[PDB]
């Protein structure tokens, strides 16, 4: 504003903020159990085992 005497004024304001977050988790598991048993009382010296 200026009248009989001059007066000067000036102001400025600016602010900026940016936040960020990122997370990712991955997991994988697997289990398999296979057992085979064979008992033969056949009566041959070789063929029973064969």
């Amino acid at each position: 504003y200026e009248d009989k005497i001059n007066v000067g004024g000036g102001l400025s304001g600016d602010h900026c903020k940016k936040f960020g977050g990122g997370k990712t988790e991955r997991a994988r598991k697997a289990m398999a159990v296979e057992d085979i048993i064979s008992r033969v009382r056949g009566g041959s010296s070789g063929w029973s085992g064969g």
Binding site: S44, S45, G46, W47, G49, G50
Partner: protein
């Protein structure tokens, strides 16, 4: 930063005994990673033992 490490471990063992040497070790060779077990070789091993 980019670091990567990988480790592997393997242990294989086998044994056999009995019978004549020829048929027994024929069974041995055809069994070890052969993936195709035969009947005639096992009959030979049978007569051998």
């Amino acid at each position: 930063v980019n670091i990567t490490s990988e480790n592997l471990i393997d242990d294989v063992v086998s044994l056999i005994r009995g019978g004549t040497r020829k048929y027994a070790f024929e069974l041995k060779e055809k069994l070890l990673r052969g993936t195709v077990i035969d009947v005639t070789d096992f009959v030979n091993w049978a007569s051998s033992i």
